[PDB]
Design a protein around this ligand. Structure first.
Ligand code: E0V
Ligand code: E0V
Lengths: 590, 589
């Protein structure tokens, strides 16, 4: 379960296997014909990491249903066999079968979290083939959820039917790497928490290991000064950090925590900070925070969902330019490269699972018994929560877990589905951070089971777009009536989505849907209400940027609710928010 | 010698790209020796990337001088049993590389690779890797910067490019650590080929360091050995029966496996011939017609930085459009792109960094003492390094020595003759050489006529002259191109185009509209299609790209057939139709 980010250390190789791989669409016979046992014949070339759907100009490739095969050569030095050799897949979307020289090494379900496998040294030949089969199919058992049966026409080919509003980008989304550790004793996991009481900042550590050896830990400032250290330690302990500088939103500070175990060496960046919900306040380092930011997507052209590190950096620069302090990983865990950069840059993150589309009625009810047609995602939902927290537990930037986006939480049985998942997240997070689910707009919002479960109420609301469109006076009144209910509960609540589709270059001085001016007026109307509610502690727009979706009559070449275009150009509303967020402090707004 | 680093049974490959520390030089960075300690108060910058567009700061974008990149380098101690090498695929424009505060190497030239061994004794348990990067350009750099060439005093000193693309700088291409055996290893591989009936003879020269035995083997993609010679020394030749030739849009690559001592290296290799004969450009002895573009390495937000998903997209669009070729205007491109073009069957005109060798657009080629251009020495080095890097690529069919130098002025022949001689001496395959000719009133005095195997012309009939008078453009185009056609040698367009803002339209000829771009091209083809010696059309440009700011640059250069995010303008569809009806071979036979 433990999944430390692979790094080059004095004891660990790191070999990136990214590049140009061979690529072949399956036609239904690829497994039967055992394509993984030889070189792919009559194949294409496809960049890795990337989604495969938009690299070529083929609708057949973009809209493909089922499996594809990736393959590359793997000629490695024999001296590596003296170490433990691990193959790490940062993400393969959605499901994967991994083969070395025709031998199946591992399988994985879940397109947005890492997995790894040791390569048995008996399998390594002088020349090797690495084959990765990737499945794109979605249904009532996957996260995200695909629909099954939900002027009629018969489609030419079978297609996935996303139960979610983003394109089903698939492939080897994030890097594949070979890494090594010592064979006989190595570090398997590191858990760090912070204790700030009695005016003494301390780091508590727990170091999980394999084998028998001696453990040591040191904490170092940016400039390399050791501020605490001990040798021949226990598996758990605490270190006092004198003069500790706390990690703050938009003012990051990361210590370097160096761990040694036998010959193994591993360094973990770490920000010291506290998070707690108290009353109607979201407290970071005991100060009342106000979220300013966005729901995002991992979406760029042409790699789709694929890791784009230049654009990760551009995006954080744009958020700081705009005055934002935060974002949510809608609607799946993001790359570790993004998470580590957010730690370095001081961007606060709401870390969300892949659980979007858990809703069969947007008559079989979503949370009916599985044997009567109810949703089949709970078991996997548990695994995603475990794996997400295991990967991201040490990040200062992560302040809250989002268990699901827009599930059927006003329907019968939702509390029963979600209670074990909230209990699991609270059990597994060593920092005991707030947990939430992101609430769909529903007529019976007072019956939303988030009220019984969440530490913060996170609302997706479209007053002025999906209701009251082109009637913002009505939108304001409808917005106030509902948000006054939420405010009456005395707990922190926020917007995690609100927006209006906006095509750059469309304009009107008079309120008109899809124009840049209407996007601004939409936000002004909503803020007239939220700025008067003391328990409203955050605003995250939908969306940071325009992004790709499945095709249909209400998607103008994707979702156009971005403040920025897909190539990151600011609409009128992006300038509106730069001005607004320039006047709102990170702390003490309410 | 600069073989592309690969993972082999004898060679580790460790990519050091990622998030690096980054600091602008404030004028004290060398004096205060920032390279000896962790960079303080630093930003973060992705590597590989140009740094100019990552943030929102004009001071960063328009910075003049040096910046410092840095990262930690904690490497496994048992790599000290190997030879450890740091490869910089490209650092634009000049670099100083430090490990632990010791200067290990320096490099001039922003678009070709360089490397340095790390001395074992310098490696500590924890190491710092610092790269200082200089962006300054002048009369001694390639590309050339100007020096003195309602007036206003600028706020800050800035580079003055003598070229029409933005001066994107930084760690443009990946930084990697690799290893080879210490005692004996392969330094370079040179391959040439000759077709005798259906048997191909591959002549090899394998350069090595140390004492060991050399072996070469040739394998099909599927893995069948088709030739092998052992204990062969440095030079030799072998034969392949019924060889599959590499063809434009029908690539075929063999795998050439070399062993020397414990060292092992695999080189993909396509077999093909290139020859100019009469007015024909012959590939595998058939008259080729170039269909394609001048490109740039340009995407948002990495600028010039390696972008492998976009490289794959661009080739896909090229094949969608019916193109077969492009030119690496105006600098060598990434090895990753060049290796993909070998794999995909895209023909390349490989161009040096020599753009802006022109002081009168004092004479350009006056003596250095008298203020003439100071680039010839570095120009020779760029030619040497470019051919050393790319010599084995089947996709490279022609070398371009310079873009739009002052070749109609006195001294030009004297400047270029040693460079053409150098290129022909160093290329084992003896491929055609050209320079790319600037539009010029005295075109019959262009020294390309005395030097080049192919005359490659940049012409803007209907844009920079005869704008909005395409009937006059056609007449003036015909008058000049009938001269070039009378010389009997192959010639082509390497640039022709018209700035076009997507979304601007008119039914009636109007510059900057999508329709005018089409009519501009239709008018030029009316002439070129009638000219026997005209053997290729490469538009300017594949896609819109960033330039310096100015009154004629509508947020960069808009002559792309595609926008910067690779969307097709009307003229992109026009060329898809046109190239669908023109064969790669035998159009003008
Ligand atoms: C089951 N699948 C679906 C989903 C949605 C719709 C349909 N089928 S059908 C239809 C429709 N019709 C009404 C209009 N009629 C003509 O079409 C032009 C046009 O719609 O562009 C109109 O301007 C023109 O004046 C009309 O003569 C054409 C069909 N109109 C509207 N909204 C308005 N939505 C739909
Ligand atoms: C040394 N630096 C440079 C370079 C180029 C140019 C200048 N300085 S100055 C100037 C100029 N004048 C500027 C003032 N201008 C007025 O301003 C409007 C406008 O140009 O937008 C016109 O529409 C309006 O009718 C005129 O009253 C009328 C001409 N005009 C044009 N070409 C047209 N180019 C230039």
């Amino acid at each position: 379960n433990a999944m430390l980010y692979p790094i080059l250390t004095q004891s660990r190789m790191l070999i990136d296997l990214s590049g140009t791989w061979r690529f072949k669409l399956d036609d239904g016979s690829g497994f039967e014909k055992k394509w993984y046992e030889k070189t792919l014949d009559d194949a294409q070339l496809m960049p890795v990491p990337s989604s495969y759907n938009d690299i070529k100009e083929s609708a057949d490739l973009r809209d493909h249903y089922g499996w594809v095969f990736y393959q590359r050569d793997l000629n490695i030095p024999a001296y590596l066999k003296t170490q433990r050799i691990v193959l790490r897949f940062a993400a393969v979307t959605h499901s994967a079968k991994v083969y070395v020289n025709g031998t199946l090494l591992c399988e994985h379900k879940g397109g947005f979290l890492p997995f790894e496998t040791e390569i048995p040294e008996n399998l390594i030949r002088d020349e090797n083939l690495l084959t990765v089969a990737v499945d794109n199919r979605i249904d009532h058992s996957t996260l995200p959820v695909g629909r099954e049966d939900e002027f009629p026409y018969t489609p030419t080919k079978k297609q996935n039917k996303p139960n979610f509003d983003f394109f089903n980008y698939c492939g080897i989304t994030r890097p594949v790497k070979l890494y090594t550790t010592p064979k006989d004793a190595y570090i398997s996991d590191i858990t760090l928490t912070s204790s700030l009481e009695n005016n003494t900042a301390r780091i508590n550590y727990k170091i999980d290991t394999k084998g028998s050896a001696h453990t040591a830990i040191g904490v170092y400032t940016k400039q390399g000064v050791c501020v605490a250290q001990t040798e021949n330690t226990g598996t758990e302990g605490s270190l006092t950090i004198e003069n500790a500088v706390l990690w703050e939103p938009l003012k990051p500070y990361l210590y370097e925590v160096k761990i040694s175990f036998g010959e193994d060496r591993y360094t973990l960046p770490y920000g010291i900070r506290s998070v707690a919900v108290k009353g109607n306040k979201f407290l970071i380092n005991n100060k009342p925070f106000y979220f300013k930011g966005y729901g995002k997507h991992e979406d760029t052209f042409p790699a789709g969902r694929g890791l784009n590190m230049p654009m990760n950096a551009k995006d954080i620069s744009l958020m700081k330019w705009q005055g934002a302090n935060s974002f949510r990983t809608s609607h799946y865990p993001y790359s570790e490269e993004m998470m580590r950069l957010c730690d370095e840059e001081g961007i606060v993150v709401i870390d969300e699972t892949t659980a979007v589309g858990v809703h069969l009625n947007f008559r079989v009810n979503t949370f009916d018994p599985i044997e009567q047609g109810g949703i089949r995602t709970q078991s996997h939902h548990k695994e995603v929560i475990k794996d997400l927290i295991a990967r991201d537990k040490n990040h200062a930037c992560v302040v809250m877990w989002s268990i699901a986006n827009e599930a059927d939480t006003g329907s019968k049985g939702a509390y029963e589905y979600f209670k074990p998942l909230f209990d699991l997240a609270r059990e597994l997070d060593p920092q005991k951070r707030p947990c939430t689910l992101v609430s769909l707009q529903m007529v019976n919002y007072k019956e939303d089971c988030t009220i019984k479960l969440s530490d913060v109420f996170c609302l997706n609301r479209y007053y002025g777009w999906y209701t009251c469109g082109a009637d913002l006076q009505a939108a304001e009144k409808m917005c106030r009536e509902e948000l006054e209910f939420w405010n009456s509960l005395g707990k922190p609540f926020m917007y995690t989505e609100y927006g209006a589709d906006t095509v750059m270059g469309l304009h009107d001085t008079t309120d008109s849907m899809f124009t840049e001016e209407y996007q601004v007026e939409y936000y002004k109307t909503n803020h007239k209400v939220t700025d008067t509610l003391d328990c409203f502690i955050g605003e995250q727009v939908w969306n940071f940027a325009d992004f790709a979706t499945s095709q249909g009559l209400i998607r103008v070449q994707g979702n156009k609710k971005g403040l920025f275009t897909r190539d990151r150009k600011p609409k009128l509303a992006a300038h509106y928010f730069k001005e607004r967020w320039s006047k709102i402090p990170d702390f003490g707004y309410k």
